[PDB]
Amino acid sequence: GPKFPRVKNWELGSITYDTLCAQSQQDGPCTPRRCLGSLVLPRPAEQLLSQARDFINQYYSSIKRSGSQAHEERLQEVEAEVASTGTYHLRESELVFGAKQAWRNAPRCVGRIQWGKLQVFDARDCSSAQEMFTYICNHIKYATNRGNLRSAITVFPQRAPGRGDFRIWNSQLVRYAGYRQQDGSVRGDPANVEITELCIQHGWTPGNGRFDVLPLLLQAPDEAPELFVLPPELVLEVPLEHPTLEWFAALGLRWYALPAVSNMLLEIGGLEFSAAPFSGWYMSTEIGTRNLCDPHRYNILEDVAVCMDLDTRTTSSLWKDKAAVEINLAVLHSFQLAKVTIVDHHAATVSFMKHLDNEQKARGGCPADWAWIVPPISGSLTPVFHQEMVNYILSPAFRAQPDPW
Amino acid sequence: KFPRVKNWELGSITYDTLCAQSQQDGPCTPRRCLGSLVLPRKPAEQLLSQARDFINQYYSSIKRSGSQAHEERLQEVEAEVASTGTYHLRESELVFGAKQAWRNAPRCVGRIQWGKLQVFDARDCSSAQEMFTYICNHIKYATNRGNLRSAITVFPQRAPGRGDFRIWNSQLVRYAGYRQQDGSVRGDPANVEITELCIQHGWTPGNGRFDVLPLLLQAPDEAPELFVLPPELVLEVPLEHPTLEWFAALGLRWYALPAVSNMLLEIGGLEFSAAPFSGWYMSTEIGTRNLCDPHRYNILEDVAVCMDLDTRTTSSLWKDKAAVEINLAVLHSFQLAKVTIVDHHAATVSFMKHLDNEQKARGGCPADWAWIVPPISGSLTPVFHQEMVNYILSPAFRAQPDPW
Ligand code: HEM
Numbered sequence A: 001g002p003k004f005p006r007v008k009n010w011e012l013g014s015i016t017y018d019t020l021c022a023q024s025q026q027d028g029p030c031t032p033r034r035c036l037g038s039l040v041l042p043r044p045a046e047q048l049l050s051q052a053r054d055f056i057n058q059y060y061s062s063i064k065r066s067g068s069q070a071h072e073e074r075l076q077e078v079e080a081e082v083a084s085t086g087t088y089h090l091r092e093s094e095l096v097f098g099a100k101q102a103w104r105n106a107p108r109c110v111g112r113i114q115w116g117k118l119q120v121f122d123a124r125d126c127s128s129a130q131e132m133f134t135y136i137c138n139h140i141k142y143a144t145n146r147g148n149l150r151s152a153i154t155v156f157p158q159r160a161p162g163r164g165d166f167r168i169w170n171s172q173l174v175r176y177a178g179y180r181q182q183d184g185s186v187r188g189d190p191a192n193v194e195i196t197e198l199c200i201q202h203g204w205t206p207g208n209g210r211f212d213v214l215p216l217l218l219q220a221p222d223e224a225p226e227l228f229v230l231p232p233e234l235v236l237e238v239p240l241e242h243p244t245l246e247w248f249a250a251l252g253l254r255w256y257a258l259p260a261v262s263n264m265l266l267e268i269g270g271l272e273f274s275a276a277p278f279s280g281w282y283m284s285t286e287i288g289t290r291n292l293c294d295p296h297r298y299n300i301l302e303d304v305a306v307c308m309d310l311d312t313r314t315t316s317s318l319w320k321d322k323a324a325v326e327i328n329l330a331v332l333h334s335f336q337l338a339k340v341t342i343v344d345h346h347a348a349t350v351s352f353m354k355h356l357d358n359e360q361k362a363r364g365g366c367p368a369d370w371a372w373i374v375p376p377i378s379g380s381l382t383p384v385f386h387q388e389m390v391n392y393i394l395s396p397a398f399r400a401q402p403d404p405w
Numbered sequence B: 001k002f003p004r005v006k007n008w009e010l011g012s013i014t015y016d017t018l019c020a021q022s023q024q025d026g027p028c029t030p031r032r033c034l035g036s037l038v039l040p041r042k043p044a045e046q047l048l049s050q051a052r053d054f055i056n057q058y059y060s061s062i063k064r065s066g067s068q069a070h071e072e073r074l075q076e077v078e079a080e081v082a083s084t085g086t087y088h089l090r091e092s093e094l095v096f097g098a099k100q101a102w103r104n105a106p107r108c109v110g111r112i113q114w115g116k117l118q119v120f121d122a123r124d125c126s127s128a129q130e131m132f133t134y135i136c137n138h139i140k141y142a143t144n145r146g147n148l149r150s151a152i153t154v155f156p157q158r159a160p161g162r163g164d165f166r167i168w169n170s171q172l173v174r175y176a177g178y179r180q181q182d183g184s185v186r187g188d189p190a191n192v193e194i195t196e197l198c199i200q201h202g203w204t205p206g207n208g209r210f211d212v213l214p215l216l217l218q219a220p221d222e223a224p225e226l227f228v229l230p231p232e233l234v235l236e237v238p239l240e241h242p243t244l245e246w247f248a249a250l251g252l253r254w255y256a257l258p259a260v261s262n263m264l265l266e267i268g269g270l271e272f273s274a275a276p277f278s279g280w281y282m283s284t285e286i287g288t289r290n291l292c293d294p295h296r297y298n299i300l301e302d303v304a305v306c307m308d309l310d311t312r313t314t315s316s317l318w319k320d321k322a323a324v325e326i327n328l329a330v331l332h333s334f335q336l337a338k339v340t341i342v343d344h345h346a347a348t349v350s351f352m353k354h355l356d357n358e359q360k361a362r363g364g365c366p367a368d369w370a371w372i373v374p375p376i377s378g379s380l381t382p383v384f385h386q387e388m389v390n391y392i393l394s395p396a397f398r399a400q401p402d403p404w
């Protein structure tokens, strides 16, 4: 056959070959000796120009003018700018294209069928921590849209030679506090202990609830971060109830509507946007399985199993499985009742299969990380489990970056 | 570079140094990871060095590393390869090698049991009839009236001249799958091809959902022969549900003994083309994959209807809820029948202990995350949150071509 990886779907028997991976210019962590695919984080003028030329080429292909005069002129303009200043700057429409392409390129995202529909807010004029806050509030308002969620990204100024970065210190725009107790346990979300403590070091008066919304720590170049409280009316939340287990509401659980990642670096043509928060909507398992049932998160499985009167003293009762299903159902039901956009893991994986087919035809492949794409409950009940995937790094890309402190 | 390996639930970290012992490349490269692929597309001196490496493993295992016996065994192996192009294992080495092949299998969640393996040496087998006798004794031994005991039977090694000893069936117990002119399948769609090969070689088919297939057994360079397993040797479990009474009416069942019969066992460069092995099931293999895969028995919808679930929308989680009850029924039914089984929580907890044992013993453990994490409730098991490094060590179990 072809000398490109063969990719099989074992449910349907169908075969594709991934040719897109040939475009990867960046190595992942695997070698012929050992696969490191399951690791969460596996650990310059000529170089900038070559990433920039590549990206400008991607742009001109996307608008079907490769080899055109406007294409050759832009290339020259980019080399001249880099030549005389050591950097360059994107056109508005280049940034929109690059932001969408980073999403389309993200191997860990099951929601990529939506990739073409992203509102890009250009905030490259931002010059202060206070203005970042305004931009972020506008982002949250637009994206939340009273529950009819819309995908969006706001892009703050790029990294610059010798000047400090724009950074949002919080990992997400909405995060529940995690308060360390004298006995060593945690009230609230244990994922957020560090950010919670940093907010308190920077003058935040802490609450003491399990769902206290954190303030934002926003950092403009070469300044200490400044603390900003989100007006509560901007943060849509959904109290959790279950459709037939009437006691579930009494548990006082809730989650926020807007999933907005704020700690990732957006890379386009070698340019680095260190503050570029992006948002979409939730797949129900993120809330109902990971955030609520991880042992190191809210860890509510046993509490729910006891309310359901399950035998929690033995693994073979499948008490964990039964409780998790009911908690996932509660999440779906509560978001539906509240008219807030959410997608269940069956619908989301079906839509990703459609995405894979669309991308096979458009680009000859789709970079995908199987362990991240397969949902954390009911894996083999979803079509993606039976689908082989090829994982590789394309650019434009969203990348993890070190914490600013 | 030795990988750092993190558990994200506990925050603990190890470094895998065992991977440096790998002499066999997987499908990944720095440009793209192919870890999710089920089978990626992939002389005396080379046999001699695999042979020496293996003999060293063995003498080290019995602590007699560097002894008279060690050096004379290396000379024997060398003398034999130099003269004949091949060599032969002593039974004690075979037993060590088979256990090590299991220990090394990255897709196996059950490896806490790796030291406890009954090895039947069947290298004095010269006919399909003889293979059948050995397979029947394996089944009787391993089944043990429901108190399942792990075992492997090792038939004669591949030899340069001639055809292989092979068991054509992928497991020793398989249900027939009867294709219909109208395309559909009665029975197990995984076994349509093997069912058809059996008929073509003379089997009189049944017409039920759970007809146990005969074995097609092949001695070198001969047509395969058909053998019907005595019904008494094949322990089966009727499936019922502890509370839902209609569930038994579905007429469902599964066999006790998972015995894989199509993999090649490689020890010291020698290759055992027929070396069936068995343990016991993890319940999700039956309750989730075999019964709920859409390309297997595909019973989710039927169960969901029996439960009166709302089937018209994904967001009712009807699939999830039905899958759970089906898994519960498998566990309940094996327990009631006193047939060994392990649930996915207990199995993954045992595998975590195994990882720790292996860290102390060998400085790592090769494991394939996609296979170790169960197909329901992944993140509810400890293995979901555990980083894993995958690589090929020898001795090994490998896939091999179908013999037809
Ligand atoms: C429109 C609805 C969307 C859905 C349902 C969705 C779904 C998901 C899910 C379920 C994950 C896994 C997260 C986890 O396990 O913690 C994820 C990861 C991700 N998605 Fe999305 N996605 C959406 C939109 C977006 C958008 C708009 C972007 C960027 C513009 C994006 C970029 C990402 C990235 C970069 C990751 C990886 C995050 C990381 O590694 O930390 N996705 N997506």
Ligand code: HEM
Pocket (backbone or CB within 6 Å): B098, B102, B105, B107, B108, B109, B110, B111, B113, B117, B150, B151, B152, B260, B277, B278, B279, B280, B281, B282, B285, B342, B347, B371, B397
């Ligand atoms: C003692 C109880 C055992 C349990 C509970 C167990 C569990 C499992 C499970 C759940 C799988 C994945 C199977 C699938 O998804 O279809 C598996 C695969 C495997 N196990 Fe075991 N195991 C056991 C014993 C053994 C033994 C005795 C051997 C060999 C001597 C072995 C070697 C393997 C191999 C080679 C695979 C991979 C099969 C393939 O790639 O086709 N295991 N094990």
Ligand SMILES: Cc1ccnc(CCCCCO[C@H]2CNC[C@H]2Cc2cc(C)cc(N)n2)c1
Pocket (backbone or CB within 6 Å): A040, A041, A259, A260, A261, A263, A264, A278, A279, A280, A281, A282, A283, A286, A399, A400, A401
């Ligand atoms: C836009 C959208 C749509 C739906 N869901 C989301 C939320 C994604 C949350 C991502 C959280 O990922 C974090 C927490 N768990 C694994 C870890 C992965 C990771 C690790 C690190 C060091 C950095 C990073 N950016 N991402 C976002």
Ligand SMILES: Cc1ccnc(CCCCCO[C@H]2CNC[C@H]2Cc2cc(C)cc(N)n2)c1
Pocket (backbone or CB within 6 Å): B038, B039, B110, B258, B259, B260, B262, B263, B277, B278, B279, B280, B281, B282, B285, B398, B399, B400
């Ligand atoms: C000892 C033991 C304990 C518990 N379970 C088992 C049964 C294992 C059945 C494995 C069958 O695997 C088959 C069917 N699904 C993926 C596929 C992997 C595979 C594919 C191919 C071509 C060959 C092969 N050997 N293995 C055996």
Ligand SMILES: C[C@H](O)[C@H](O)[C@H]1CNc2nc(N)[nH]c(=O)c2N1
Pocket (backbone or CB within 6 Å): A038, A039, A040, A371, A372, A373, B008, B384, B385, B386, B387, B388
């Ligand atoms: C160790 C393992 O890589 C890790 O727990 C991964 C597995 N798959 C995941 N998949 C998603 N979508 N999100 C995650 O946080 C994780 N965690």
Ligand SMILES: C[C@H](O)[C@H](O)[C@H]1CNc2nc(N)[nH]c(=O)c2N1
Pocket (backbone or CB within 6 Å): A010, A385, A386, A387, A388, A389, B036, B037, B038, B370, B371, B372
């Ligand atoms: C494509 C994917 O690798 C394939 O469906 C794998 C996933 N994980 C698995 N895990 C186990 N234990 N058994 C399997 O057959 C599979 N199938």
Ligand SMILES: [Zn+2]
Pocket (backbone or CB within 6 Å): A030, A034, A035, A036, A037, B028, B029, B032, B033, B034, B035
């Ligand atoms: Zn890999």
